[PDB]
Amino acid sequence: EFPILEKQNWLIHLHYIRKDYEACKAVIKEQLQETQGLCEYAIYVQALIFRLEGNIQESLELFQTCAVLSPQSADNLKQVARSLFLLGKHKAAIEVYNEAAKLNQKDWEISHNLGVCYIYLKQFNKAQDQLHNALNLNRH
Amino acid sequence: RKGHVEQARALLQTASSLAPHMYEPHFNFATISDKIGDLQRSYVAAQKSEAAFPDHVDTQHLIKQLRQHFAML
Amino acid sequence: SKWLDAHYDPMANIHTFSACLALADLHGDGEYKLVVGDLGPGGQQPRLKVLKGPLVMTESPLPALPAAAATFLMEQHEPRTPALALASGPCVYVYKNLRPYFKFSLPQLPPNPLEQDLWNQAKEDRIDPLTLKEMLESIRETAEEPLSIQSLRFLQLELSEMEAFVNQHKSNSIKRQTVITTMTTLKKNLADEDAVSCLVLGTENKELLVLDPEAFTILAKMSLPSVPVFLEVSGQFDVEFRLAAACRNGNIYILRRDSKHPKYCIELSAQPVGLIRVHKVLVVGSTQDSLHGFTHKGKKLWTVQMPAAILTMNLLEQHSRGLQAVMAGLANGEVRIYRDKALLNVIHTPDAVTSLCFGRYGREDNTLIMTTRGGGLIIKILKRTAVFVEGGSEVGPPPAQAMKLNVPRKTRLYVDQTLREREAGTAMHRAFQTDLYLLRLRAARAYLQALESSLSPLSTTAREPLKLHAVVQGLGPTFKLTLHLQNTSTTRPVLGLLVCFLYNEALYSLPRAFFKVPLLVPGLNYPLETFVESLSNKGISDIIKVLVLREGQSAPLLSAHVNMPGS
């Protein structure tokens, strides 16, 4: 048929789970060029490859595009704030985690990354209960 | 040793740009910039402390300390 | 506890996965015929391949990139082999003795009715370019329910195309397909193999279909909050039914018999690369190479670490011995075999293996087929005499004598030196202090000799350092001098200082000689370049100063740059 089949994400997730990052970059360039543009999962795992290499400044603007195409998803607004925990800008990240903490409740790691990002600040007392909030939902 | 972090992190910043060999500022950058939390510059710091001197001990206990943070939690 | 090398054919081109290989008898005889959904050596066209003996039997083109392969029974009509199923796109193609028929269709779930109002307003020539582009922004941004496989390209089209498609874009009857990801087999109505088999299909709409033999309508429907890529079934029916599935979010989801919700959820740290069950425990493979194990309800039982990256996992089942083991195709080329916590054996020979099955091939009952990463083949054959042992030695920590207490040897030239220290040492202590007491004075009298002149490139009040260098292009009569300023504050931008260099007049010019420095931001380093124009060959040092704005002429950070002798 005419438009796109638009879903071949089952293959790209097989490449990234196999750590074959050189063949996966071809299919990301293939599927994004096969569609007219703005594919979702081809953007996401391309940002998760650059975050494995150290290019965290490039794995933050790609997660900004992935924060646009689905603003009701609690994944990317959580996954952006992981890429801001690593660039050093700590206090900027604790509100984006709160931005995902209100779009979804009862989540384990969002109440845990808020714990560890307070300890790299100097606020300690409101970090100790955050991990207690992160332990009761899921022990790790 | 005294506490002047931002003073120290600029002298190592200019010790590296004068000697683009000699691993000792590069590794020493990545134990100031790791204790703060900037795990992106503290990778490229401890990247050059491998290429300019491999078989170091406390670089290989630092890149694998960082590459666990980069994959997932 | 050894194998037999059947063949080794490293020249073939078989690019596939462990999900799309199957062992069944395509002609109804006793010969088990391997079937492989070959993708393509460079991502080429998908071509179906079946195997008879060590070489291929029939090839066939495929409509799309295939997902998995299974073999399924009809009823008691004939005792022939189960009919082959092939999942590819949103259309599974069943194959029963190489007969292409029954292109099954997905249910094609319809979009949400807020999109249907945009579907129903422009098709009667009531189309406006602006207010269509804003009504879609009220759909996607408040609460999505998007179905944006086709609805997104039903909305992203701009002013020029949509006004040219006032009839066409509204004649595009949307199909709303959804691509199947995976496929597995469940014995229907009972746990025995003599009963019929029942399809389970997971797809991109995070839902788990379950199909029926010979009618293929729908049996039921399950709801999962994440897209599944690895799944299995314990296999029972009509009294109890456990459906386990792994997802892209790194979780383990299990399903009850009729409750269509994930009753128990357990997580990992990373993506599971394979989901295989044992008789009662269920194992996963993390991509951090930590092969776990979880029980029926699912708790932590044991964990084996693997010294290389996991790449393939599969199930071992011997009909004679009754042994249930789990495979692990590693990255260097070895294939480790494991029971509950014991390594059974390894096969070190080939390169990296991507595909793996273990069953009967043709007449022989013990065959463990594997496949190179380049596309070639390698076949192993077990013998009847070999039963699998541990047979593992006691590999200790350090049995090597590589370093036996590396300590340097102290010769006679040290042992006479301690006798000089023992008797006349009391004169040596007072000799050190009164020589060090001049050293503190000689340092501080030379320290303050430059601190008052502020020769040091470091400061405290206005907090920048100053580095400077002669650049490579600065050679000969022409000469270029860079200069490096950078603030050391976090939030205090120093403002509008002055750089001037007094210098003993040699025969160079330096035409600007007095700048106004820009606003230094905290963090960035600034290159500042000049142009020395020397006329003949001399060498004499410059002194480059930086001042505060108007009041303090005390000149902090004056750097006595020593020049190179140019020609």
How was this entry determined?
A: cryo-EM
* Radius of gyration over every alpha carbon of chain B, rounded to an integer in angstroms: 12
- To the nearest 10 degrees (0 to 180), the angle between helices A90-103 and A76-83 is 170
Structure tokens at C324: 């249930």
Pairing of strands C310-317, C324-330: antiparallel
Q: Do the chains contact at C288 and B14, CB–CB below 8 Å?
A: no
Asked whether A73 and B56 are in contact (CB, 8 A), the reply is no
Structure tokens at A19: 């750590």
Q: Which of C8, C75, C25 is nearest to C381 (CA)?
A: C8
Longest dimension (CA), chain B: 37
The residue written with tokens 């100063």 in the block is C545
Our measurement of the distance from residue C501's CA atom to the centroid of its chain's CA atoms, rounded to an integer in Å, reads: 54
Neighbours of C407 (CB within 10 A): 6
The residue written with tokens 């503290």 in the block is B42
Sheet strands side by side (includes C55-61): C21-24, C33-38, C47-52, C55-61
Structure tokens at C91: 């259309």
Helix (H, G, I), strand (E, B) or coil at A68: coil
* Strand ranges, E, within C298-342: 304-305, 310-317, 324-330, 335-338
Residue C4, class by beta-carbon neighbours within 10 Å (0-12 exposed, 13-18 middle, 19+ buried)? exposed
- What residues are paired with C253 via a beta bridge? C245, C265
What are phi and psi for residue C137, nearest 5 degrees? -70, -15
Choose among C250, C270, C465: nearest Cβ to B10. C465
Sign, Cα dihedral of C433, C437, C443, C447: positive
Longest dimension (CA), chain C: 114
**CB proximity B64 to C under 8 Å:** no
Virtual CA dihedral for A54, A56, A58, A63, nearest 10 degrees?
130
Structure tokens at C296: 């029926």
Q: Which of C209, C183, C207 is nearest to C72 (CA)?
A: C183
- C-alpha distance across the termini of chain C, in Å: 80
What are phi and psi for residue C533, nearest 5 degrees? -120, 85
How far is the CA of C421 from the CAs of C411, C412, C415, C427, in angstroms? 17, 15, 11, 10
DSSP C455: -
Asked whether A60 and A84 are in contact (CB, 8 A), the reply is yes
DSSP C343: B
Separation in Å, CA of A70 to nearest CA in chain B: 22
Q: Please state, in angstroms and rounded to a whole number, the distance separating the CA atoms of residues C486 and C464.
A: 6
Asked whether B11 and B18 are in contact (CB, 8 A), the reply is no
Asked whether C370 and C329 are in contact (CB, 8 A), the reply is yes
Q: What's this structure's resolution in Å?
A: 3.8
The residue written with tokens 């001042």 in the block is C547
Q: Do the chains contact at C465 and B11, CB–CB below 8 Å?
A: yes
Longest dimension (CA), chain A: 60
Q: Please state, in angstroms and rounded to a whole number, the distance separating the CA atoms of residues C61 and C64.
A: 9
Q: Which of C465, C467, C470, C462 is nearest to C496 (CA)?
A: C462
Helix (H, G, I), strand (E, B) or coil at C145: coil
- What residues are paired with C22 via a beta bridge? C35
Q: Please state, in angstroms and rounded to a whole number, the distance separating the CA atoms of residues B56 and A41.
A: 39
Q: Please state, in angstroms and rounded to a whole number, the distance separating the CA atoms of residues A90 and A121.
A: 8
Neighbours of A107 (CB within 10 A): 17
Asked whether A93 and A101 are in contact (CB, 8 A), the reply is no
Residue C73, class by beta-carbon neighbours within 10 Å (0-12 exposed, 13-18 middle, 19+ buried)? buried
Helix (H, G, I), strand (E, B) or coil at C243: strand
Contact list in C for residue A3 (CB cut-off 8 A) is 150, 153, 172
Asked whether C220 and C210 are in contact (CB, 8 A), the reply is yes
Structure tokens at C370: 């594997």
Number of CB pairs, chain A paired with chain C, less than 8 A apart: 57
Length of chain A: 140
**CB proximity B57 to C under 8 Å:** no
Contact list in A for residue B47 (CB cut-off 8 A) is 54
Asked whether A25 and C279 are in contact (CB, 8 A), the reply is no
CA angle A140, C251, A85 (to 5 degrees): 60
Structure tokens at C375: 């596309």
Virtual CA dihedral for B54, B59, B65, B69, nearest 10 degrees?
-70
Alpha helices, H only, B1-73:
5-16, 24-29, 33-36, 41-51, 57-60, 63-71
Q: Do the chains contact at C465 and B73, CB–CB below 8 Å?
A: no
Q: Which of C181, C176, C172, C117 is nearest to C150 (CA)?
A: C176
Q: Please state, in angstroms and rounded to a whole number, the distance separating the CA atoms of residues C222 and C209.
A: 7
Q: Please state, in angstroms and rounded to a whole number, the distance separating the CA atoms of residues A48 and C250.
A: 14
Q: Please state, in angstroms and rounded to a whole number, the distance separating the CA atoms of residues B73 and C262.
A: 24
CA atoms within 13 A on the CB side of C514: 3
Q: Please state, in angstroms and rounded to a whole number, the distance separating the CA atoms of residues C369 and C3.
A: 12
Q: Please state, in angstroms and rounded to a whole number, the distance separating the CA atoms of residues C422 and C425.
A: 6
Q: Which of C130, C135, C134, C131 is nearest to C114 (CA)?
A: C135
Q: Do the chains contact at C465 and B6, CB–CB below 8 Å?
A: no
Structure tokens at C212: 């029926």
Q: Which of C51, C47, C60, C68 is nearest to C9 (CA)?
A: C51
Residue C536, class by beta-carbon neighbours within 10 Å (0-12 exposed, 13-18 middle, 19+ buried)? exposed
Query: What is the secondary structure of C466-519 as a DSSP string?
Result: EEEEE-TT--SSEEEEEEEEE---SS------EEE------S---S--EEE---
Q: Which of C455, C484, C453, C449 is nearest to C558 (CA)?
A: C455
Q: Which of A54, A122, A121, A112 is nearest to A83 (CA)?
A: A54
Helix (H, G, I), strand (E, B) or coil at C37: strand
Q: Do the chains contact at A19 and C287, CB–CB below 8 Å?
A: yes
Asked whether C198 and C211 are in contact (CB, 8 A), the reply is yes
Q: Please state, in angstroms and rounded to a whole number, the distance separating the CA atoms of residues C1 and C385.
A: 8
Q: Which of C476, C492, C489, C485 is nearest to C531 (CA)?
A: C476
Q: Do the chains contact at A3 and C150, CB–CB below 8 Å?
A: yes
Contact list in A for residue B73 (CB cut-off 8 A) is 109, 112-113
Mutate to test the interface with C, among A7, A19, A33, A75 (most CBs of C within 10 A): A7
Q: Which of C300, C303, C301 is nearest to C288 (CA)?
A: C303
Asked whether C217 and C205 are in contact (CB, 8 A), the reply is no
Q: Please state, in angstroms and rounded to a whole number, the distance separating the CA atoms of residues C104 and C216.
A: 8
Helix (H, G, I), strand (E, B) or coil at C444: helix
How far is the CA of C155 from the CAs of C137, C146, C159, C177, in angstroms? 9, 11, 11, 17
Q: Please state, in angstroms and rounded to a whole number, the distance separating the CA atoms of residues C438 and C460.
A: 29
Neighbours of C248 (CB within 10 A): 20
